[PDB]
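Worked example 4.2. Below are the chains of a multi-component assembly; read each line carefully before continuing.
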Amino acid sequence: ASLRDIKTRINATKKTSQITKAMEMVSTSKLNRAEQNAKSFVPYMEKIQEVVANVA
Amino acid sequence: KTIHVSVVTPDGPVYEDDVEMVSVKAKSGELGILPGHIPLVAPLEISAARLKTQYIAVSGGFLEVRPDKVTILAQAAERAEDIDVLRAKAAKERAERRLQSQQDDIDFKRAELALKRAMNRLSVAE
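Applying the procedure described above to all two chains together yields the following structure tokens:
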């Protein structure tokens, strides 16, 4: 059933698979840096939380 | 004896060492801190922190001193020992920050144009 149309549809969805895989990899790297920012923020939050606790 | 200083920002730790005299100034006035000090909390004014030497300019800023925990919670803590260098660093980092805020958005929209054309060709292929 339109062998050429099937093969063009196969190549188009392979291209979308490649693009969404690249975007998955970019979001893995950005997730790594976002959890690095969270673990760099955490000692400030621990210290200000214990100061607010002891004062208030 | 020495006391352990650690100036802490929300972005991360800036300075951490063992300093004999800490000469921060509060909203009321000066404070000269030695090891064995009483536990006290005092908000810091927008000025340098005199550590005896390396001077640390803090912005926002809040001090709590225990006899080993004289740490400083600052919203913005420079290093270059001058009251206006934090303002110059903020003027530079605002520029770098909106350059990054535009770079991230245009990179996402380029990748999304690639995805939208690649799914256009899938929908046209039928």
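Take a moment to check your reading of the output against the notes. Chain B is about 35% helix and 25% strand. The CA atoms of residues 119 and 125 of chain B lie 10 Å apart.
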